[PDB]
Structure formats: structure tokens, C-alpha cells
Coordinates of N, CA and C and ligand atoms in Angstrom, one line a residue:
X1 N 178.2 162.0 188.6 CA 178.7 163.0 187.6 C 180.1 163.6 188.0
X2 N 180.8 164.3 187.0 CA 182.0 164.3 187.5 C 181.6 166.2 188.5
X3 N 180.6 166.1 188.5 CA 180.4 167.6 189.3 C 180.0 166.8 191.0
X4 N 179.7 165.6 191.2 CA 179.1 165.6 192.4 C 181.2 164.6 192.6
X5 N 181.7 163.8 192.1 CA 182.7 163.5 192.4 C 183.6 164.9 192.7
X6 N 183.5 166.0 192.3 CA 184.4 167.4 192.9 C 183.7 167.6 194.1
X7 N 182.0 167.4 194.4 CA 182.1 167.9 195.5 C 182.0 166.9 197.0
X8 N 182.8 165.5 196.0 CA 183.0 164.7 197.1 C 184.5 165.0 197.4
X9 N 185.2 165.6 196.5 CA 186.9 166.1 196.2 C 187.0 167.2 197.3
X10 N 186.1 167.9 197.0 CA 185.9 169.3 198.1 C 185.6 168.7 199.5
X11 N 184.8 168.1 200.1 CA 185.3 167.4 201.2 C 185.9 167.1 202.0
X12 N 186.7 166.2 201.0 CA 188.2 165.6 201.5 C 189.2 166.6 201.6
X13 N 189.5 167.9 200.8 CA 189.8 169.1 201.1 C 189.2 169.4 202.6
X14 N 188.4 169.6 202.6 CA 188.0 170.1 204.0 C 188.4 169.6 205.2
X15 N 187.7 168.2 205.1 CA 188.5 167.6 206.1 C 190.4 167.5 206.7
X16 N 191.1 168.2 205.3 CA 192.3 168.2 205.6 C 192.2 169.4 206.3
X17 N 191.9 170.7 205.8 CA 191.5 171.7 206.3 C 191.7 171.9 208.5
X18 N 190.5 170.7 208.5 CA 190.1 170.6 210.3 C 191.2 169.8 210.4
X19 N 191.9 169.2 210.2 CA 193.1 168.3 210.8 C 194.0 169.0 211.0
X20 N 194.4 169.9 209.7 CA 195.2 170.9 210.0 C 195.0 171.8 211.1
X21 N 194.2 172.5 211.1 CA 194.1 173.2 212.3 C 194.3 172.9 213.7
X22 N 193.4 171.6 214.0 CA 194.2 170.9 215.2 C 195.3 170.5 214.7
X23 N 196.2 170.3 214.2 CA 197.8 169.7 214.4 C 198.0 171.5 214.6
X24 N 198.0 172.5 214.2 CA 198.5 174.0 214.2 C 198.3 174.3 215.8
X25 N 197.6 174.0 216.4 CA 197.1 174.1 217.8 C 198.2 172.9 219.0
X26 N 197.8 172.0 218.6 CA 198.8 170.8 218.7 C 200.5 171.3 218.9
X27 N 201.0 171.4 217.7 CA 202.2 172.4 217.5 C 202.5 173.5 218.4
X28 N 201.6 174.5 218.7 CA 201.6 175.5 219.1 C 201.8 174.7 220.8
X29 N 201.2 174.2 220.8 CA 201.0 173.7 222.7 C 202.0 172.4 222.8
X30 N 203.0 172.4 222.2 CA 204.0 171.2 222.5 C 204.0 169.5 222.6
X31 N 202.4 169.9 222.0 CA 202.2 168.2 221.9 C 202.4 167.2 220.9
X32 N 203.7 166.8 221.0 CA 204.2 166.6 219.9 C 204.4 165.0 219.3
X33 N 203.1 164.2 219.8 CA 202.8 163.1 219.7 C 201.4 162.9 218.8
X34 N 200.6 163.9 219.2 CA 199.8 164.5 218.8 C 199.5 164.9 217.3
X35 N 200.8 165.7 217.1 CA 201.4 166.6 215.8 C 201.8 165.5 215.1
X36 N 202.7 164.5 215.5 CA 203.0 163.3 214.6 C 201.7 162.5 213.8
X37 N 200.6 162.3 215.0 CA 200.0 161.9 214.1 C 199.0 162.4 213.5
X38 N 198.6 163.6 213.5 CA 197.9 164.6 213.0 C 198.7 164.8 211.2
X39 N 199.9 164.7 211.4 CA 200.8 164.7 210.0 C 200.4 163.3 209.2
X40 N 200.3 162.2 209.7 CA 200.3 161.1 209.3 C 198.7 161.2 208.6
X41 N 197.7 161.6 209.4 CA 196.7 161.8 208.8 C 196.3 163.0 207.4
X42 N 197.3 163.7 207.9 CA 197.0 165.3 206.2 C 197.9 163.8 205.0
X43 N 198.8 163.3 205.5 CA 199.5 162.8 204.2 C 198.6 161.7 203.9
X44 N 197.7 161.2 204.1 CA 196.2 160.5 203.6 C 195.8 160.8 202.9
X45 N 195.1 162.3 203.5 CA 193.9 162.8 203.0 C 194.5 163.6 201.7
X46 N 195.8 164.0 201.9 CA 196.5 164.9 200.6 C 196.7 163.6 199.5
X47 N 197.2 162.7 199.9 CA 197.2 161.8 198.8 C 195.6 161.1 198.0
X48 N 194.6 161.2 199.1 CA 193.2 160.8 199.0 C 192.8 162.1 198.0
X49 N 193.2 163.4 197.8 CA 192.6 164.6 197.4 C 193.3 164.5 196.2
X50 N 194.3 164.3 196.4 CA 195.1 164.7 194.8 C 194.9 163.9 194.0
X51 N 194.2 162.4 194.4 CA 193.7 161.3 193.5 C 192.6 161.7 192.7
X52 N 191.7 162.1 193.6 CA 190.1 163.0 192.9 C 190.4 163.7 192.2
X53 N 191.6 164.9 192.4 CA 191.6 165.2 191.6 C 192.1 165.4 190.6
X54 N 193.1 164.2 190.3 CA 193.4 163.7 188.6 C 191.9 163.1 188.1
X55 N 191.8 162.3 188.8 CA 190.3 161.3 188.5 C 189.2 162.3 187.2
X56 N 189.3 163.9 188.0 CA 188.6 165.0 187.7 C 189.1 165.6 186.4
X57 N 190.4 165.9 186.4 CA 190.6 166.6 185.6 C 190.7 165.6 184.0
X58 N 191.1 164.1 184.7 CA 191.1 163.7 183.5 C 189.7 163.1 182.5
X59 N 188.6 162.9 183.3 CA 187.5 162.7 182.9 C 187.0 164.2 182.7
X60 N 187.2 165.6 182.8 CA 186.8 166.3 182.1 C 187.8 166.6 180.7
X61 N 189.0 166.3 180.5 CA 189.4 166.0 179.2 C 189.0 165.0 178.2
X62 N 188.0 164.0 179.1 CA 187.7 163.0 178.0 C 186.0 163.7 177.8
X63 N 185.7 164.6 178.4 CA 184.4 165.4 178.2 C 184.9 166.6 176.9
X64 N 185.8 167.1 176.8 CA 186.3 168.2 176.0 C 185.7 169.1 176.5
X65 N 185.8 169.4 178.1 CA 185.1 170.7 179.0 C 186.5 171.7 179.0
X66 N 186.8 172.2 178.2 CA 187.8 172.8 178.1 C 188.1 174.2 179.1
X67 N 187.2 174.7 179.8 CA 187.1 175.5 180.3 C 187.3 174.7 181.9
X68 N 186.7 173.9 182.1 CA 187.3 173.1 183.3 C 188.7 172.1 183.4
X69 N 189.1 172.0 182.3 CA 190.6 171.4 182.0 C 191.4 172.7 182.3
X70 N 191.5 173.8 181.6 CA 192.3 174.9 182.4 C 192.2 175.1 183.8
X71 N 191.1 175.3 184.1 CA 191.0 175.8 185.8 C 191.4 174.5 186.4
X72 N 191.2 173.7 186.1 CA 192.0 172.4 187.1 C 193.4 172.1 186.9
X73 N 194.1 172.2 185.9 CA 195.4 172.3 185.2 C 195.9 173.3 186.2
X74 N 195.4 174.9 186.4 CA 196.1 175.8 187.4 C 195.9 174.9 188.4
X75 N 194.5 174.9 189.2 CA 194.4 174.3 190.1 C 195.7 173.4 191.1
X76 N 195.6 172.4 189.8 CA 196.4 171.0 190.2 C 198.0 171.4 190.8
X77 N 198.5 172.4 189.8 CA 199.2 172.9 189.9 C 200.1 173.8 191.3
X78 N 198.7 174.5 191.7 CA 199.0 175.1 193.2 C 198.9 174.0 194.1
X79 N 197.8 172.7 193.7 CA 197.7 171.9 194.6 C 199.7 170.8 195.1
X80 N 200.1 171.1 193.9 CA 202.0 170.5 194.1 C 202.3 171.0 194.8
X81 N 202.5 172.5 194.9 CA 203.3 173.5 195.6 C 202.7 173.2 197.3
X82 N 201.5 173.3 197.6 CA 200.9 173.0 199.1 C 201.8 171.6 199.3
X83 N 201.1 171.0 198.2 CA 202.3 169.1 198.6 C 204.2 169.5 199.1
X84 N 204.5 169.9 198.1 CA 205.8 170.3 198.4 C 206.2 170.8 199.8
X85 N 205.5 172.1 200.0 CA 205.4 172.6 201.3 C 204.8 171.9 202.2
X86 N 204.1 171.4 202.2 CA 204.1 170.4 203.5 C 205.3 169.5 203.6
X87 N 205.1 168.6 202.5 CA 206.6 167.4 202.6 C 207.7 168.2 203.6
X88 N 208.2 169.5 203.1 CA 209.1 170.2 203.7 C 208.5 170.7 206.0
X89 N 207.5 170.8 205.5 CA 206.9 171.0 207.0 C 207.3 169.5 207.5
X90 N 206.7 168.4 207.1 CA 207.3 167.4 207.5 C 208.6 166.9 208.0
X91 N 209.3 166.8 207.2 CA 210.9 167.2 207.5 C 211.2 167.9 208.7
X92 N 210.5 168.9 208.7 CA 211.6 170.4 209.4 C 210.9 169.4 211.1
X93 N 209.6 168.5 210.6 CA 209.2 167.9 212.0 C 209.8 166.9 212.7
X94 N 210.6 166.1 211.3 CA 211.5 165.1 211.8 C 212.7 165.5 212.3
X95 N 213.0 166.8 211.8 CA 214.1 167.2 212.2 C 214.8 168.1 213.5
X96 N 213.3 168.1 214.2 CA 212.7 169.0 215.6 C 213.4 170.6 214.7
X97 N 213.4 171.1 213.5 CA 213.9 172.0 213.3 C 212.2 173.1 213.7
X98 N 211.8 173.6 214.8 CA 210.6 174.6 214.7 C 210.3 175.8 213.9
X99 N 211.7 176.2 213.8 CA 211.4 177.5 213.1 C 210.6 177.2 211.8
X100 N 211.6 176.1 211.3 CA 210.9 175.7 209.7 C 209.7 175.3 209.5
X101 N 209.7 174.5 210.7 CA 207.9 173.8 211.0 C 207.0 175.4 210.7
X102 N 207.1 176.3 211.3 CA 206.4 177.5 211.4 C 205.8 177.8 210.3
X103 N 207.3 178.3 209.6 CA 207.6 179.2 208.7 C 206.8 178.5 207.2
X104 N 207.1 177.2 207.0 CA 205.9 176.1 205.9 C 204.7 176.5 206.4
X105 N 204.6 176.2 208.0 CA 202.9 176.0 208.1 C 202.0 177.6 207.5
X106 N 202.7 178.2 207.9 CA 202.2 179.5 207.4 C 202.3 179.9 206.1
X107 N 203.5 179.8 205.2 CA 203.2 179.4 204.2 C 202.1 178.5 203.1
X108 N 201.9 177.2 203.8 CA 201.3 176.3 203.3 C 199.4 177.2 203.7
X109 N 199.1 178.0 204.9 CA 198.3 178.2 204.9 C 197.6 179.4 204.0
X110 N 198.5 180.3 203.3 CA 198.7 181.1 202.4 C 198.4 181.0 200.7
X111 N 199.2 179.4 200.4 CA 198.9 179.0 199.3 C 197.4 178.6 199.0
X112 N 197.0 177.7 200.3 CA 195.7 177.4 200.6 C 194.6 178.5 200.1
X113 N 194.4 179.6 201.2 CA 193.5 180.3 201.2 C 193.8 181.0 199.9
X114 N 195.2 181.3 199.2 CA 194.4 181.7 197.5 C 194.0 180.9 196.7
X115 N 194.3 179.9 196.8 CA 193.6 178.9 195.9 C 192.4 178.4 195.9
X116 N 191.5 179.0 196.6 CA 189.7 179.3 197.3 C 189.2 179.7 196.0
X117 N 189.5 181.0 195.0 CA 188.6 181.4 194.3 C 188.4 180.3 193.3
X118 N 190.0 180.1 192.9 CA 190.1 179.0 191.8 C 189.4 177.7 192.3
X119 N 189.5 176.8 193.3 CA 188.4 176.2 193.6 C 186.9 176.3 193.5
X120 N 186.1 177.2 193.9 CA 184.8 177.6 194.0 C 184.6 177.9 192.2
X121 N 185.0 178.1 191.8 CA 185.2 178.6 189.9 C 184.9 177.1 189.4
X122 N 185.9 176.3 189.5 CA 185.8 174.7 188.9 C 184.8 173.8 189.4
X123 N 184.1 174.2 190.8 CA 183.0 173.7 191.0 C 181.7 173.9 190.0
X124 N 181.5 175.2 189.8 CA 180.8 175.8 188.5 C 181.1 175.6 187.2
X125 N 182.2 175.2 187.0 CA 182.7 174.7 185.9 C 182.2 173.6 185.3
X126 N 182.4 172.4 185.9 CA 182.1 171.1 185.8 C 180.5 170.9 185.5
Ligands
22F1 O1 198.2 172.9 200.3 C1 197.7 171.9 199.8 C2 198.4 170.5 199.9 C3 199.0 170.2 201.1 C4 199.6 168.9 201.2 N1 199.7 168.0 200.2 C5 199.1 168.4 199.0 C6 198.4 169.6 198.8 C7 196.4 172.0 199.1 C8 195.5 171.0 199.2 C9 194.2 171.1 198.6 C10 194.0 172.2 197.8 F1 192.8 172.3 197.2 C11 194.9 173.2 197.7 C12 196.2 173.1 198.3

């Protein structure tokens, strides 16, 4: 069902979640071999998450669950902005720029944690 496919979506979320954290640790302690490929792994899993969730949003438009087409439409939405901001974390890593590296990561963890309610909502939705 497309409700147990979100909570295989939510997962893969998570798991980006723990990788992030260790690469933030990683960063923090200069390991920066580490951090390279800790990045190579979120750009998987972000690409593996944002597939689910088109897969999602567009099979509940062929449901006419109209209430879960909005909330995934926001959703999807804050889910670019995280993309974006990482891509840019990325960079500021190729670029040994740290400050920037920072200044995204904490960002990107900000965007995250609001976009909790709206997640946990579209689970119920579906
Ligand atoms: O911040 C991101 C994100 C990070 C990197 N690439 C894509 C999305 C994010 C990922 C999943 C999510 F549910 C909300 C936000």
C-alpha cells in the first residue's frame, strides 16, 4: 500500500538522519576522509528518499487522496530546500571552505527537524 511504501520512505529518511550525524562528528574531529565518504553516502540515500517520495505523492494523486497530495506537495517542497542546502554543504567541502560547511550543516539540520510535524501528518494521511 502506498501507506507501508511511506513507511519504507520514512526509513530511508532515517537512515540518512544516522549518517548524518556521524559525518557531523567526523567534521567536527578532522576526519576528513571519513566526511568524504559519509557525503557520498547522504547523496544515495537523499536521492534513494526523494524517489519514494515522488513514487508517493504521485500514486496518491492517482488515488484522488487529496488531503495527502497537499501535505506531500509542502512536504516535497521543504524536502528541495534540505537538497539544495546540502549540495551547497557539499561544495563549501570541496572547497575546504569550513565556515560554510558549518553554517549549511546547521542549517540543513533546522530545515530537518521542522519538517517532523509535516512528516508524521502524511503518514496518517495515506
Ligand atoms: O534536508 C533534507 C535533504 C537533504 C539532502 N538532500 C535532500 C533532502 C531532507 C531529507 C528528508 C526529509 F524528509 C526532509 C529534508
Amino acid at each position: 500500500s502506498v501507506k507501508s511504501e511511506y513507511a519504507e520512505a520514512a526509513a530511508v529518511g532515517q537512515e540518512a538522519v544516522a549518517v548524518f550525524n556521524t559525518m557531523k562528528a567526523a567534521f567536527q574531529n578532522g576526519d576528513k576522509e571519513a566526511v568524504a565518504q559519509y557525503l557520498a553516502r547522504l547523496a544515495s540515500l537523499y536521492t534513494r528518499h526523494e524517489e519514494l517520495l515522488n513514487r508517493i505523492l504521485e500514486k496518491a494523486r492517482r488515488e484522488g487522496n487529496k488531503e495527502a497530495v497537499t501535505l506531500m506537495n509542502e512536504f516535497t517542497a521543504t524536502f528541495q530546500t534540505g537538497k539544495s542546502i546540502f549540495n551547497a554543504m557539499v561544495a563549501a567541502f570541496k572547497n575546504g571552505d569550513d565556515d560554510s560547511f558549518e553554517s549549511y550543516l546547521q542549517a540543513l539540520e533546522k530545515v530537518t527537524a521542522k519538517g517532523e510535524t509535516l512528516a508524521d501528518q502524511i503518514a496518517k494521511a495515506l
